[PDB]
Amino acid sequence: GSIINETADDIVYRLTVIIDDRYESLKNLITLRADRLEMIINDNVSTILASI
Amino acid sequence: GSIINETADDIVYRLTVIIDDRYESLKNLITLRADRLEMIINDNVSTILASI
Amino acid sequence: GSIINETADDIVYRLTVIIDDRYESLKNLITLRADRLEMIINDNVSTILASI
Amino acid sequence: GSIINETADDIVYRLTVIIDDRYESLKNLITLRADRLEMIINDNVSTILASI
């Protein structure tokens, strides 16, 4: 088992949870903002083309 | 409440503070640059729509 | 090395792998979304120019 | 001895370097891709206006 290895495992696990949570938040934000940009560009270009 | 467990807590706490700091900076950067791009896109589309 | 040095190396190694993986995924996502926006914009400008 | 304190400090120090390096790479990439998109958009609007 080892106290030392269990402690190491615990540190790696807890920080992995933190890193993952922040990673997912950033991933979701990038996805959200890039989606918004595609939508705005698509709307605007369709407006330009409809306006001649 | 061992010296080993207090030490583990300290390591996790200290690196969480740093991770959070960088996360918040990246979040703010993404948000500011995306807002800025939306503004530039709409300003430019307005200029094109005004030129017929 | 000593038990404690090896344990510290193991903790740093294991979290570096985690950090590097999340980093790579974020880098790939940003590159993908920005690449796609450039592709969309390039196509749209060609379409606008061809419509006069 | 003080080796457990020192080793914890060493772990925090080493991972701080890793975290900060990945943070800086992402910061720089987002900033670069944003700047590129802004340049493209500005060039394209000029090209379009120069046509009608």
Please tell me the distance from the alpha carbon of residue D12 to that of residue D1, in angstroms, as a whole number. Answer: 19
Closest Cα partner for C35 from B33, D33, A23? D33
**Which chains have 3 or more CB–CB distances shorter than 8 Å to chain B?**
A, D
Closest CB to C11 among A8, A30, A34: A8
What does the DSSP assignment read for C3-50? HHHHHHHHHHHHHHHHHHHHHHHHHHHHHHHHHHHHHHHHHHHHHHHH
> What is the token pair recorded at A42?
């698509």
Judging contacts by C-beta atoms under 8 Å, the chain C residues touching residue A8 are 7, 10-11
Interface test with B, best of D5, D19, D52 (most B CBs within 10 A): D19
Please tell me the distance from the alpha carbon of residue D33 to that of residue B8, in angstroms, as a whole number. Answer: 39
Per DSSP, helices labelled H in chain B are: 3-50
Please tell me the distance from the alpha carbon of residue B34 to that of residue D34, in angstroms, as a whole number. Answer: 8
Q: What are phi and psi of D50, to 5 degrees?
A: -60, -5
Question: Quick count: other Cβ atoms within 10 Å of Cβ B40?
Answer: 16
Closest CB to C47 among A12, A26, A49: A49
For residue D44, how many C-alpha atoms fall within 13 Å in the half-sphere facing its CB? Answer: 23
Q: What are phi and psi of B42, to 5 degrees?
A: -65, -40
Closest Cα partner for A27 from B16, D26, D25? D26
C-beta separation of D25 from C25 below 8 A: no
Please tell me the distance from the alpha carbon of residue C35 to that of residue D29, in angstroms, as a whole number. Answer: 12
> What is the token pair recorded at C22?
């999340």
Please tell me the distance from the alpha carbon of residue A10 to that of residue C26, in angstroms, as a whole number. Answer: 25
Judging contacts by C-beta atoms under 8 Å, the chain D residues touching residue B36 are 34, 38
C-beta separation of C11 from D14 below 8 A: no
Q: Does B37 touch chain D (CB under 8 A)?
A: yes
What does the DSSP assignment read for D1-48? -THHHHHHHHHHHHHHHHHHHHHHHHHHHHHHHHHHHHHHHHHHHHHH
Q: How many residues does chain D have?
A: 52
- The answer for residues whose C-beta is within 8 angstroms of residue D23's C-beta and 6 or more apart is B22, B25, B26
How far apart are the CA of D14 and the nearest CA of chain B, in angstroms?
10
Element (H, E) at A36: helix A3-51
Burial C5-28 (b: 16+ CB within 10 A, else e): eebbeebbebbeebbeebbeebee
- The answer for residues whose C-beta is within 8 angstroms of residue C21's C-beta and 6 or more apart is none
Q: CA torsion angle for D34, D37, D39, D41 (degrees, to 10)? A: -140
Interface test with A, best of B5, B12, B37 (most A CBs within 10 A): B12
CATH number for the domain formed by residue range(s) C1-52: 1.20.5.1060
Single-letter amino acid code for the residue at C40: I
What residues does each domain of chain C span?
Answer: 1-52
